[PDB]
Ligand binder design. Sequence first.
Ligand SMILES: Nc1ncnc2c1ncn2CCCCNS(=O)(=O)NC(=O)NCCCC[C@@H]1SC[C@@H]2NC(=O)N[C@@H]21
Length: 323
Amino acid sequence: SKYSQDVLQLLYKNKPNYISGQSIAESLNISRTAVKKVIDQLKLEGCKIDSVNHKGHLLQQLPDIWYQGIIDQYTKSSALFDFSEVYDSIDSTQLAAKKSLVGNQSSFFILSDEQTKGRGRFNRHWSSSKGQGLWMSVVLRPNVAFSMISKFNLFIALGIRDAIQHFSQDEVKVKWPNDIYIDNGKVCGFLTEMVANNDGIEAIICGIGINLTQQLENFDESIRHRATSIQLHDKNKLDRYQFLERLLQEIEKRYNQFLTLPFSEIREEYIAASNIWNRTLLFTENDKQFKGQAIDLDYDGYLIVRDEAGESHRLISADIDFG
Ligand SMILES: Nc1ncnc2c1ncn2CCCCNS(=O)(=O)NC(=O)NCCCC[C@@H]1SC[C@@H]2NC(=O)N[C@@H]21
């Protein structure tokens, strides 16, 4: 309905108190009977709303669906983000973000319950199941040189890891430079892109995909053994709204660190949170592949690699597989 988001927002704003049907009706200038119809539909979509005679309605729990009216509250109180766009389905939040950033200096994020053309690094297919993951693109406006893209990627990794770690009883680790793992399971892939020229960055677009509630059966058999979800490591129901709130918190925290701190001030923290050490790694580099060991991460965020032949490498980025 036309007023479903408006009603949902009123319910959300008024927690933990009940709000009467009459008061919603007056707030939105619609009838009591249209308020009731909207609320029945919200409950049908899986909103847990307690309704009590003479008292009104209390929103108790939201379903695994993104609602614009709720997310609007997140951006209203955000010092970072001007707005969000929320979709049930699109080709890709990253395509959408890249179109929406043109011609303005707004900071914003784009969420979709489902992506039909999710793409990771090297245009690889990213599986984006409806109602099972956070598929999001974040657009930010750092006033910095284009070479700073690499350090942004390192800072944001730690924020995403921290947000996920709050909900996982199991160790969450970063694989440099672009993924998050729980044990052998990839729980998140992110990538950082930019629009830029020699005078500076016009926008950062960080595309973030986080598996929230997949069971193992919900991953294609080709990736099942290398994929996992937060829910598979959380004894409690993962609430996607609680999680998003924590994720935006950490993104903002790490973005402000990115603007103010050298990478050397988080380099040790990064190293202790990574899962690339003390193991043979497989590198892909255009048409050639080689094996090696990660020796160090230097003050600039470059990986120091000693390959199979004993030769050292210093890498701004790499395409790394475990085995
Ligand atoms: N759901 C899943 N979970 C675990 N594994 C899966 C999987 N789907 C496929 N695979 C195996 C294949 C991985 C190959 N990619 S990677 O090179 O290893 N790293 C990587 O791509 N990072 C960046 C990912 C960017 C996704 C976000 S989403 C929102 C935004 N909009 C969009 O379009 N992109 C971005």
